[PDB]
Design a protein around this ligand. Sequence first.
Ligand SMILES: [Cl-]
Ligand SMILES: [Cl-]
Ligand SMILES: [Cl-]
Ligand SMILES: [Cl-]
Ligand SMILES: [Cl-]
Ligand code: NA
Ligand code: NA
Ligand code: NA
Ligand code: NA
Ligand code: NA
Ligand code: NA
Ligand code: NA
Lengths: 311, 311, 311, 311, 311
Amino acid sequence: VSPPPPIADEPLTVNTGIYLIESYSLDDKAETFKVNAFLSLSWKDRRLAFDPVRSGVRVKTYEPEAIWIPEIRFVNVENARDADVVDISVSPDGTVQYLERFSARVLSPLDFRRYPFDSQTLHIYLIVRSVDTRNIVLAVDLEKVGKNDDVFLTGWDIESFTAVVKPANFALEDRLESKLDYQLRISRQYFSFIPNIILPMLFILFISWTAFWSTSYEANVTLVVSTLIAHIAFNILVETNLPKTCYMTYTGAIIFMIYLFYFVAVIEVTVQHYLKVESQPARAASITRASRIAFPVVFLLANIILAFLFF
Amino acid sequence: VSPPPPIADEPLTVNTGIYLIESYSLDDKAETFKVNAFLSLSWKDRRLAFDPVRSGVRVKTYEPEAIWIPEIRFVNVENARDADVVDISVSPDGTVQYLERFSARVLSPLDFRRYPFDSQTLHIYLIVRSVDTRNIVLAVDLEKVGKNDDVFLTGWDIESFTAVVKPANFALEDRLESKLDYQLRISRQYFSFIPNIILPMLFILFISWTAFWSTSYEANVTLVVSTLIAHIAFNILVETNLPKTCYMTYTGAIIFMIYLFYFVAVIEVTVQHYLKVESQPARAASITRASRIAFPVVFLLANIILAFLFF
Amino acid sequence: VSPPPPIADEPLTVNTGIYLIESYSLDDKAETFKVNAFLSLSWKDRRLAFDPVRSGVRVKTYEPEAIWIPEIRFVNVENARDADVVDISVSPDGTVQYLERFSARVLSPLDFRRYPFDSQTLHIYLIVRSVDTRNIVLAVDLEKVGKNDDVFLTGWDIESFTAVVKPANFALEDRLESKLDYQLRISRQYFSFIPNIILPMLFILFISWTAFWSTSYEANVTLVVSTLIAHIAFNILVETNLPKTCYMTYTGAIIFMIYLFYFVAVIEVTVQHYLKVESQPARAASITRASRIAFPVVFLLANIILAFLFF
Amino acid sequence: VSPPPPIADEPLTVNTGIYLIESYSLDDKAETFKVNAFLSLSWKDRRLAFDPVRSGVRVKTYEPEAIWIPEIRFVNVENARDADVVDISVSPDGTVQYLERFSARVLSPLDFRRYPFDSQTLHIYLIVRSVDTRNIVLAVDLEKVGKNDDVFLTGWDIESFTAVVKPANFALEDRLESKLDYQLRISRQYFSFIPNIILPMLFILFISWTAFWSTSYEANVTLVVSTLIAHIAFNILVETNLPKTCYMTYTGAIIFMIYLFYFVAVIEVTVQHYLKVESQPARAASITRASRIAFPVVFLLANIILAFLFF
Amino acid sequence: VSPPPPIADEPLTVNTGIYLIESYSLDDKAETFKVNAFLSLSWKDRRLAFDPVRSGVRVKTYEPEAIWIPEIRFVNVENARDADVVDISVSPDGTVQYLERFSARVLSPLDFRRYPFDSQTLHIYLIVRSVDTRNIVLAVDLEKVGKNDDVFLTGWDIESFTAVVKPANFALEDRLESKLDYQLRISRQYFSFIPNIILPMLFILFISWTAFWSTSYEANVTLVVSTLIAHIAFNILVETNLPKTCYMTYTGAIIFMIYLFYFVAVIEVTVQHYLKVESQPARAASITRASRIAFPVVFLLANIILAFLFF
Ligand SMILES: [Cl-]
Ligand SMILES: [Cl-]
Ligand SMILES: [Cl-]
Ligand SMILES: [Cl-]
Ligand SMILES: [Cl-]
Ligand code: NA
Ligand code: NA
Ligand code: NA
Ligand code: NA
Ligand code: NA
Ligand code: NA
Ligand code: NA
């Protein structure tokens, strides 16, 4: 089978449409997500045109083998899509209406800079290669683009599934290519982030600040160093949530700042002890007393500065 | 092959039935489970009808290729089902009796709010797309819906496998679709949750309350902070047996409240020490003595309040 | 092709045989094990009978497509077996000698109540569905059931591979089914559980009992709480080695009892300190002295009681 | 189908070209990476020549089955590539222009000696085995070798995708083989390595050096041993971000040196205490005072020496 | 197609040869390794013989379907090999020369008794089942057995790839079977085992022995118990690099002996304290002083005894 011939020098328009049935397995670390969906294609092949009153029937059904079908592919997929043709229907004028149901593991990069308040735009790229006999351009049939209401993605709120209607037509290896961008916008849903990660982590930190109300070097060392170990053990515990990145994250900065707060606390505890042993407890008391307000204030300000920087 | 033509205007009824052979691999985190089962379908195609007298035989066996079979699909499956046709049998009147054996990884959302006492309703959705020549509706043959007695799901009690007899008929991408709901009800079975997770966690907490019978700040700091580390280490240990959710869990609330109890204990220990060093051991003793009854009482009440809230 | 017709009303006997070539990947947590084996089937189809004198040859070889072969399936398999036909050989009387080499991931529940001294019985169920024309029953050819001598399963001792010769014939979805039980008996060979899990766990516990020879509350708190953390860290270390169950295990019970021993030790340490501070060191010394023999004795007895209860 | 016959004794030249569409799943531990690309091949088969006047069309399209296509394979791939033919086009002269799209998990060794500043040269080897009738040699069409601009590999910066134009022609199992080297040059991108791994690790080490300003053996033991535990806990935490190698890494040298610094600190702490108890606090103070500058200086120098040795 | 008939009673000799292209994914815990190789087979089929003079050509190429090919299989493979026929050539006398490229995940038991100094012998078993008409025996063509020079196995040194030339002929299920043993000898390469596992582990143990230079029970308890926790944390860290076995290992024995050394140290610390409190510091000092030389000496000898016992 060969592609349909043109009336004049015009290319062939293929009316695409992706309707999401199921979305699942969003791997934050692999930057992949799986999707089960319909793919509807529609073009006009006049060789397939028929008179309805002579044939008796209003639409003819065909097998994929029987007719010319455009080679549509996905750009950002791991392997070839697991597709099964649902129906092929030709109208009297030759307009083919193809429909298939596929499942694919899609690659879309993620932006963890604002985690756990981050919103993502997942992409699904459709592409078609233009043949020698005639050029092929992709079109969006907005009536055939959507998603089922049950469609969920655990820990996320699925906002919208839309398509960039203007295709990116370009040249590649001496032939024309028509690319389409399907966008799945998702915002993070993590209500339990505060009681499960932030709040227990902050308690550990405030426990260490009780050293500003003690004069026992031995107790203070235990307080500041043990809570530092407890902070690490707490991090080995909630590490699954800790977004695995190579740029600085909002959550990533806070964690770093917390390590600095533990270090500075040790300095104070060491200073207070040294001045006390050097028989100058007047300064040792001044510092400890200052630190009682200095540590919470500097922490609150530094978090305001950060929150501002990231949002 | 084309679908059977109607005598009048009536749609084609397909009598469905799923009989579970083997259930397994329930992934609480992925919200998936795997199932091995039979799928029985039945429809009336009068084109295949035959007189038993002249043919000699009462039932004719066919190959899938030889006859028209409806395109039945699962909605909430990860990839296409691994199906193998068992038998196709046409009765004299043309009533086809299809049977296949399939295996599929099903997506059914889970509700961890009441874990480890949670009960789930696993769904299996059957769907058929109506063709242009004829509309197709799904029906349930209750005599062909069930499960083998050996059918197990480790850590769960399989209660019932039933089907919502009324199909959800709706319009999708300009064509009619008949959807069916098969429900697998399972209640959690975790007897060892108390001795393996709750009881050792509570012992750690009670160890921390021995600080209300000590006046040694150095011993108390060790007691309350070490058991806090031990609580985390215990959590990194039973981290597998922890339900991973983005809403608040019963178990998850307890865990949070336990972190608050550790924090408050530190405050008491710090207060008792400060009042003692500030030469006011009369109130330091009062507080420590109150805490001896205050900490267990508030803990018991708060757990009653929580258990009431979730159940 | 259709099944062979009966001389009388008798059903068709298919002589089964599974010979294990390789056993591997026993997943204690998934309750699965993979196997690579031969499957030999033998029946009598008189339509295939031939005179050896006129034909010249004593046995005729056929292609699966060329002749009727019964639809044999496995019950407890994850997906369809990866089978490849080795040889099909028809004797003069019409007796077919089928042989195929397959590999399958089998599901067989495990009993961890007596771990690490547990022995398991892995099952492989063969099933055949009776057709309309004639009923099919499965038989065991003991000469064709066995296992290679190299057959190993790391973590176990392979005792026997036998078959329950009497098939479980029953009715399902209005048709007869003949089921067969193949049993692979394996006993656990973990001979180093003691030096790797039990002995170090016990050392850590005995270290805590040195608190009965000390009067230093501060040292005792460190001793009993640190070894409690060390017990957890040891458990996060050997947790891969330990069993994953939703009932009570022998190992599980001991672990639980050990947590109780840590709690009781804390009570003693707390009591001894309180009586000493309340200026009553006569009873504080009595208790500590009693505990020196009470803790080991109660431990030995309780382990005898438990070992008896489980075995 | 047989290969095209030579005019004279010249071999057949196949013009290769790999254009990367997607690069992903770089497994540092497995030394593998996955890739999704186009493979364009071009050779001359004069048996396929045609007159565009008689044939009507300027280029004929063929099915893989219909014509002779060279058996091109990848050397360093895990399994066979998941290829799908895009287009086969023959010009009147007999020049075949093949194009397929393949996915493949490629094996290229990695050099972690300079991690996290390491750069890699990933290889993709194309090979063709010469047949008996005529020899086959591989050629590079530089116009058909490249990569899409969106092509990413998380935590790395993709520098270049080039091909060694001269094929490595050699003899293997008595026949000629033409091998081609495609090189993907990447350099590590880990900005957050300093705040997430190095800086918190160093804080923990500096905390241990506060023992040079204390005389309390009990506090010093806690300081040096607790930070040693904290160093390990931190390493179990960042364990993921550590290259798992069987030679010495730049990072692996630093980590080792840090363990030596902890050991030496213990010696000092032990020595200072012994001299103090042996009533010689003049030397004990000298050592502690020296260590205040000795430990940071030796650490800075040793890191300079190392950084120089590795880079 | 049927097998070639014999001139006499002689069996058919098939000349085997495996040439390794790629070796990878050696899973120490699963006892498996993946391999990508050529498989060359050669047998004499006189039915395929041809006079060069009449035929015109010296060698005829065939399709697998066109001629009789022996059913060669691998014994110790997980699933069926992913094979693709490269070339089939028939010389004028009838000598078929088959060549295919395959990939297989092989099963080869490993011996971790001498880890990390262990050397392994990986096996690849070729087998052929004798047919009724003619018996089949396997032969080794040493000119066709080898490995590419780039062939690597990370963390191992590939010594040799040879084949046991004498096949193991035996009877299985009433038919003759010819088995061949291909051996891949690999010796471990773990230079960094000393700085990454042994040396930091010994430093922890050495730290514990500083308790023999202290009289502070409180400091000694911290020293011995904390380093015991640090030993565990270190083990949870390097547990990836420790042989995941059953039977006693060289590394396995050392680790155990180290746990005994921690326990004995506690006894000394406890004894020294008890004698001191019981006002007998003459004996308490003697023991501590003896232990200063007793602990290192007994450790050095016990390791000498061990290494002798294992090597
Ligand atoms: Cl695609
Ligand atoms: Cl489906
Ligand atoms: Cl099966
Ligand atoms: Cl390949
Ligand atoms: Cl094989
Ligand atoms: Na298509
Ligand atoms: Na179907
Ligand atoms: Na302590
Ligand atoms: Na079969
Ligand atoms: Na090819
Ligand atoms: Na500690
Ligand atoms: Na073969």
